[PDB]
From TrEMBL, chain A:
Family: Belongs to the eukaryotic ribosomal protein eL13 family.
Top-rank taxon: Eukaryota
Name the record gives this protein: 60S ribosomal protein L13, putative
Signal sequence extent: none
TrEMBL record, chain B:
Gene Ontology CC: cytosolic large ribosomal subunit
Organism listed in the record: Entamoeba histolytica (strain ATCC 30459 / HM-1:IMSS / ABRM)
Top-level taxon of origin: Eukaryota
One of the GO biological process terms: translation
Protein name, as recorded: Large ribosomal subunit protein uL4
Compositional bias of kind Gly residues: 81-90
Molecular function per GO: RNA binding; structural constituent of ribosome
Keyword entries, A-Z: Ribonucleoprotein, Ribosomal protein
Family statement: Belongs to the universal ribosomal protein uL4 family.
The Large ribosomal subunit protein uL4 C-terminal domain, residue ranges: 276-323
From TrEMBL, chain F:
Upper lineage: Eukaryota, Amoebozoa, Evosea, Archamoebae, Mastigamoebida
Keywords: Ribonucleoprotein, Ribosomal protein
Region annotation Disordered: where it falls in the sequence: 1-24
PANTHER family (UniProt xref): 60S RIBOSOMAL PROTEIN L29
GO MF terms, alphabetically ordered: structural constituent of ribosome
Name under which the protein is recorded: 60S ribosomal protein L29
From TrEMBL, chain G:
Molecular function GO terms recorded: structural constituent of ribosome
GO cellular component, one term: cytosolic large ribosomal subunit
Entry keyword annotation includes Ribonucleoprotein: yes
Name of the molecule in the record: 60S ribosomal protein L32, putative
One GO term (biological process): translation
Length: 44, 323, 210, 167, 148, 60, 129, 50
RNA sequence: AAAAUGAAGACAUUUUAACGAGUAAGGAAACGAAAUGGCGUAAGGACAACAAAAGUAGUAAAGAUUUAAAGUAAUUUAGAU
RNA sequence: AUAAACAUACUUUGAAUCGGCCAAGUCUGGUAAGCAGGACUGGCGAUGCGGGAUGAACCGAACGUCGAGAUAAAGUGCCAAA
RNA sequence: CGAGAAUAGAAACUCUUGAAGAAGUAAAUUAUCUACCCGUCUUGAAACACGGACCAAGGAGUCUAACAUGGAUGCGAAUGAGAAUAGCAGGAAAGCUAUAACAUGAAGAGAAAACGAAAAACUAUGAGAGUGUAGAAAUACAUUUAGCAAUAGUAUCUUUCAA
């Protein structure tokens, strides 16, 4: 199969890793809870 | 499916309950070591933390090779003068204080994917092996004294356990303390460079206490006991039921968790409820035994008699051997 | 297991904070235990050590009892007048002792130890009354489920369940065929060894009977 | 030495159960015993087909079983492979022995009044094989076979693995 | 599993399985698909014989949603409602109540005619129909309905 | 840097290690490019015979 | 009863040029040089390990006393060969202390098992004792 | 009866397991080595086969 | 390679027959009659005195120097200092 | 006629390689070459062993570790077994 | 005189050496035979071809991404949904649960417009199952039946200027 791979540019500076993903849940869930406690109609 | 009965014991009084419970259908799933090995090999890597060397480690010099005509190799050399470092080796892989072979990068693959249905296959095969006393003991558990290897305790006794003195008392009543003392007596220290990283103590594995939704207060009691791990019935995985990829963990079920098993995993004919899309598989063989086929074929006079190979005589010389 | 995310379980970080701790936290670390006579008088387990105190060495070559002559917090040691070693040419030098190998037998209590000891005493009592409140609550919930029993059963001997009800499961025939060779051989040898021990035990009992 | 045409090299025939499946290991133990003792060509066939790789044991659908069992009313189809379900066509009453049955195939066969047997029950009931019909699925239907060869060929061109700018 | 690679089995062999006469050098004919018409022409002729050239008209902005048209054959129509419903209405004819197969509700737009339908009346509701699809539905006693 | 041009040395020894692959039987039985009228007659009878075979199947 | 143990080669297969150079150790390595004297099996230097040198299957891994070695770490590990005393011989590991060695030695005498390290880590009772 | 491989020996007050019998009911047996028979003595007149 | 036997023995079964040179190169792991067999380095999860104190260790660990033993070999085991 | 069931037919994936050299009851150019280039086969390369004193190709013959015998090329005054 | 066969008969031993060290094994020396410098390029190196004074430690097919073949694994007209993301217990970079957008596949041909598959198939050889006879131990013939996989060839149908 004819290969079409776009790694000629500096991909090493283009690499984005998702190591913060398990902590986005904790951030968003906690903030989502905090808004509910502030004015529960708002988070509706 | 006759599904033999299972007794439920009182953890405080030691008295069996008057109402037996049918064995859940999850205990008759095929016990596939190869499927468990595939899942455990993938899942055990999911706790790994990213690591990597410095990106600029060993590349922080302006070195260029001296070229030929100087009676030295062509590896790059540090520039300048006045110190011992100048004129020495440079970035090269084999040089001292240079970068190594392909440097480890923090974007490696630390976690491994696995299909969900193959993960549920391995848990059912790991649960079934926990009801085989031969496989439980061969894994390294002392279960010679327990009444039933699918050990269930009353949910009434569990609800009263609030201290580790009571949790230890219950474990003594149901004859499960042999494993707890094996872990206590055999605790030792790690052998190697793992002690500088903080990993010093190396204990063994003991009973696993599987509890339901009504047993959230008894968790705190069992957690300080050495070599006793607790897990909720829904959160079972290969990392609990087969530590070290050796199936047959000694499990202590509670009444609430034992009865929920049928709903969670379903039967061989009913699709599961807790795990939608999954159904217990049928083993390649209906009855995993070879004796009943032989005796029936023997009764039909089909098998030939057992053959013992004749002793082939050694070659002789008829011209010289009269016999 | 630790659950406070602020504190660290790293052995290296613990030692670094031990060496670089200031004088304020060094005093509270060189504590010693009171003796029986002093414990009964004050109801205090341990207090930080002080100069002009009288201690008794309990671990070491010489278990002498003397007076504390130096509390060296930089070296985390203390000095006793009785424990000395002659330095060849004739002069004697004190021998350093870790403060965890001694127990105090006579306090040097001017005015701040008195305030400390009273504060240390009430803290013990306040915790004792709090543990008692929890213990009855645990006992109260145990009676509501087993009204015929009392909580003292947990401190006595335990009688194991001797009933041996077996279960028929259509996998015991496959048990030998579900082990790998390294764990099959060990399992079979354990069976062979166990049988031979039972054979000798049986023969011995027959000889004992006869 | 001796002028041989070629030296002795391992024969390229499997003789045991591939993998670490404990149940499939016992099936080969059972039919290796039956074929050796009964000396029946049926057991030698089932033993051989149990030792093929997964790719060489293609599936058979309920539609294909129905067509092959049309003129064999009281018979037992025997296919050493997974039996899937063809939802397009109805499933009549028949007895099938196979290594594994799809959840939908097992329901369809049972609901029609038939039976789903495993190979130990077949050996217990028909060891030498008396009212059975040997069936195997098609092999050339694999899509991998399309790309084999040279796609520039004049006679039977291949299928040109797709890639960069394929028209 | 780095312990199962061929590198661990070739330790002690000088060239690591790459040859002595022809070494393992940096390149073997260019980087990427280089030389597609000079020295790798026999590769492109042999294995991608239509790689170079042009064909067809350019679509400056292709609206790929206008070509979306999932298809289902006639024999597969009854699988949308299952065999349980199919047997229930097996003995119906004109005049009484007949199940309706909503292909659009299941994501199927065009109904093609391939295979054989069960000999029961049925109402097929869809967006497009093949000529042979409508013939096979009508030849069995059914009706075809348009949508959208 | 003159080099040797060509040699048939060792070529026959190579061609006989895996000997001359004869064609299969189906190679000789191909019918593409046969006589036009002959193919028409053969097709006519194969259509006639198939229809007769099929109506008996439909009859039973 | 003891069979006759026959060894086809009692010497050692030393590495090539291990005698001339101290950086080359004596552990065997197959010479892969294109012009190597030993690999080409010249006269004089044609001594390589080959499977034909293997000893008889019956008497393989058998000590000269006629028994097979069995390592033991405590008295309980002796019971695993307590029924095969005519085939196996005990072997106390190199790290077992002198105190635990006495228990193993005195227990094996009870079970009638041969021990090969029976004179290991003995105290100073050699002269005037 | 004792297993064929079990030949009990006396323990000089050394620690013994539970299963191993006490020496009071353990009787020593003299070690036996010879297993072949000597040559038979025939008549003075008759000659040996050898 | 072919016969026989086969839930565990064991030496990777038993018997018979043919065979064994080799640069470049190949033969990943698993697969009871095993679709090559193994040695070594370091780390992670388990197992290691089955009767409630369960691998070794101040009655001397790792390491170093040698003497012997096992293995065709990679190497392993043990004694002495 | 003779041989052929570890026969036969293969399918897929892939390694290395396309600097060659020698012999001759062979050929072409050249005065000729241990020169240059070819047809057929066997070899060396990749190959050790016995003989030709010594030798990549010559003659016998191809190799798991050994014991006993009959041999091959070729030898039998001494080196050197006869 | 005598094969077969029937009937009766017969084999258990000596000497020497060895804890005053047997047999074997190892080390050093001697003696006969034997042995050119390793790695590499090369048709060919022990080469008057190149690197190598000696020792220790370090030292070179790895990681990410796309495709294909192949062996083990789950499910199967579906598979995946550890797509983001949202919840659960426990405090958790781990574990469990989410009727779900989509990815690949189930339909193919055409540049595109426009379309979109049965004569409920045929022929040949082929896996398997019986019954009888006989040798006679296994096995060798006769005969009834079925004809899967695979290969090849046919009709028929979709698309294409063109199969």
């Amino acid at each position: 199969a004819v290969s079409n791979i776009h790694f000629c540019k500096d991909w090493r500076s283009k690499v984005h890793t998702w190591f913060k993903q398990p902590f986005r849940k904790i951030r968003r869930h906690q903030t989502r809870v905090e808004k509910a406690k502030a004015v529960f109609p708002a988070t509706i | 499916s006759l599904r033999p009965f299972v007794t439920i014991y009182d953890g405080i009084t030691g008295e069996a309950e008057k109402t037996p419970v049918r064995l859940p259908a999850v205990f008759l799933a095929p016990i596939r070591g190869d499927v468990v090995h595939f899942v455990y090999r993938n899942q055990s890597k999911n706790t790994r933390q990213p690591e990597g060397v410095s990106t600029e480690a060993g590349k922080q010099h302006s070195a260029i090779s001296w070229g030929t005509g100087r009676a030295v190799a062509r590896i790059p050399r540090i520039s300048g003068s006045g110190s011992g470092r100048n004129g020495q080796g440079a970035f090269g892989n084999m040089t001292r204080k240079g970068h190594m072979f392909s440097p480890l990068k923090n974007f490696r693959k630390w976690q491994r994917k696995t299909p969900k249905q193959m993960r549920r296959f391995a848990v059912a095969s790991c649960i079934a092996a926990s009801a085989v006393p031969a496989l439980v003991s061969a894994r390294g558990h002392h279960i010679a004294g327990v009444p039933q290897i699918p050990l269930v305790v009353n949910s009434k006794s569990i609800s009263v356990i609030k201290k580790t003195k009571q949790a230890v008392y219950l474990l003594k009543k149901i004859n499960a303390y042999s494993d707890v003392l094996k872990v206590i007596a055999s605790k030792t220290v790690r052998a190697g460079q793992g002690k500088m990283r903080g990993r010093k103590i190396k204990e063994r594995k003991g009973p696993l206490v599987v509890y339901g939704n009504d047993d959230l207060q008894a968790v705190k009691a069992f957690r300080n006991i050495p070599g006793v791990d607790t897990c909720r019935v829904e959160n079972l995985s290969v990392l609990n039921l087969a530590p070290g990829c050796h199936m047959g963990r000694f499990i202590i079920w509670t009444e609430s968790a034992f009865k929920k098993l049928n709903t969670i995993f379903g039967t061989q004919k009913k699709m599961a409820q807790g795990k939608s899309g999954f159904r217990i598989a049928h083993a390649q063989m209906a009855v995993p035994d070879m004796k009943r086929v032989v005796v029936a074929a023997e009764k039909a006079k089909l098998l030939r008699a057992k053959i013992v190979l004749p002793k082939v005589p050694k070659r002789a010389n008829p011209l010289k051997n009269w016999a | 297991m630790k659950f406070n995310c602020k504190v660290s379980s790293n052995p290296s970080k613990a030692r670094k904070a031990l060496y670089t701790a200031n004088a304020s936290q060094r005093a509270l670390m060189m504590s010693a235990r009171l003796s029986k006579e002093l414990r009964e008088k004050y109801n205090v387990i341990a207090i930080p050590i002080h100069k002009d105190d009288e201690v008794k060495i309990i671990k070491g070559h010489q278990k002498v009892a003397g007076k504390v002559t130096a509390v060296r917090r930089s070296k985390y040691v203390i000095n006793i007048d009785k424990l000395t070693k002659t330095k060849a040419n004739g002069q004697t030098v004190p021998i350093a002792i870790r403060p965890s190998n001694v127990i105090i037998t006579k306090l040097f209590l001017n005015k701040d130890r008195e305030a400390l000891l009273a504060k240390k005493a009430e803290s013990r009592k306040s915790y004792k009354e709090l543990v008692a409140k929890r213990n009855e609550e645990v006992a109260k919930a145990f009676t509501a489920v087993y009204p015929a029993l009392n909580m003292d059963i947990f401190g006595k001997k335990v009688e194991p369940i001797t009933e041996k009800k077996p279960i028929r499961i259509p996998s015991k025939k496959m048990a030998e065929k579900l082990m790998s060779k390294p764990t099959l051989r060990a399992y079979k040898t354990g069976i062979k060894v166990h049988k031979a021990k039972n054979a000798i035990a049986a023969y011995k009992a027959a000889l004992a009977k006869k | 030495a001796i002028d041989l045409d070629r030296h002795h090299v391992r024969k390229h025939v499997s003789k045991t159960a591939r993998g670490n499946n404990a149940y499939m290991k016992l099936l080969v133990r059972l039919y290796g015993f039956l074929a050796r003792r009964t000396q029946s060509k049926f057991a030698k066939t089932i033993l051989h087909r149990l030792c093929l790789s997964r790719v060489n044991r293609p599936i058979v659908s309920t539609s294909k079983l129905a067509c092959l069992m049309k003129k064999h009313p009281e018979e037992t189809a025997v296919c050493v492979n997974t039996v899937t379900y063809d939802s397009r066509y109805p499933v009549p009453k028949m007895n099938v022995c196979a290594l594994k049955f799809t959840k939908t195939a097992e329901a369809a066969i049972t609901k029609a009044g038939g039976k789903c047997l495993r190979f130990d029950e077949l050996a217990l009931k028909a060891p030498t094989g008396r009212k059975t019909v040997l069936i195997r699925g098609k092999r050339n239907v694999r899509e991998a076979l399309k790309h084999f060869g040279k796609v520039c060929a004049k006679k039977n061109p291949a299928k040109q693995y797709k890639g960069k700018q394929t028209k | 599993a780095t312990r199962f690679r061929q590198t661990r089995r070739r330790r002690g062999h000088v060239s690591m399985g790459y040859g002595r006469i022809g070494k393992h050098r940096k390149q073997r004919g260019g980087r990427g698909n280089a030389g597609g018409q000079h020295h790798r022409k026999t590769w492109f002729t042999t294995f991608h014989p239509d790689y170079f050239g042009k064909h067809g008209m350019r679509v400056f902005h292709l609206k790929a949603n206008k070509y979306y048209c999932p298809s289902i054959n006639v024999d597969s129509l009854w699988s949308l409602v299952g065999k349980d419903v199919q047997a229930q209405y097996k003995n119906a004819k004109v005049g009484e109540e007949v199940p309706v197969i909503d292909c659009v509700k299941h994501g199927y737009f065009k109904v093609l005619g391939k295979g054989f339908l069960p000999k029961q009346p049925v109402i097929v509701r869809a967006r497009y129909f093949s000529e042979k699809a409508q013939q096979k539905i009508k030849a069995v006693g059914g009706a075809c309905e348009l949508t959208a | 840097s003159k080099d040797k041009n060509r040699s048939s040395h060792n070529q026959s020894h190579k061609a006989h290690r895996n000997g001359f692959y004869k064609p299969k039987k189906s190679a000789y039985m191909s019918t593409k490019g046969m006589n036009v009228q002959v193919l028409k007659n053969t097709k006519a009878q194969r259509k006639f015979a198939l229809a007769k075979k099929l109506e008996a199947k439909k009859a039973a | 009863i003891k069979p006759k143990i026959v060894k086809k080669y009692t010497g050692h297969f030393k590495r090539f040029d291990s005698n001339r150079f101290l950086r080359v150790k004596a552990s065997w390595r197959v010479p892969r040089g294109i012009d190597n004297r030993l690999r080409r099996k010249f006269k004089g230097t044609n001594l390589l390990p080959k499977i034909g040198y293997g000893s008889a299957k019956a008497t393989r891994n058998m000590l000269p006393c006629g028994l097979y070695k069995f390592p033991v770490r405590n008295t309980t590990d002796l019971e695993m060969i307590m029924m095969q005393n005519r085939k196996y011989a005990a072997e106390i590991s190199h790290a077992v202390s002198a105190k635990k060695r006495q228990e193993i030695i005195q227990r094996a005498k009870i079970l009638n098992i041969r021990v090969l390290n029976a004179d290991a880590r003995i105290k100073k009772q050699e002269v005037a004792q | 009866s004792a297993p064929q491989w079990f030949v009990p020996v006396k323990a000089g007050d050394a620690k013994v397991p539970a299963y191993y019998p006490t020496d009071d009911m353990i009787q020593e047996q003299k070690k036996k080595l010879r297993t072949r028979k000597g040559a038979k003595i025939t008549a003075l007149d008759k000659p040996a086969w050898n």
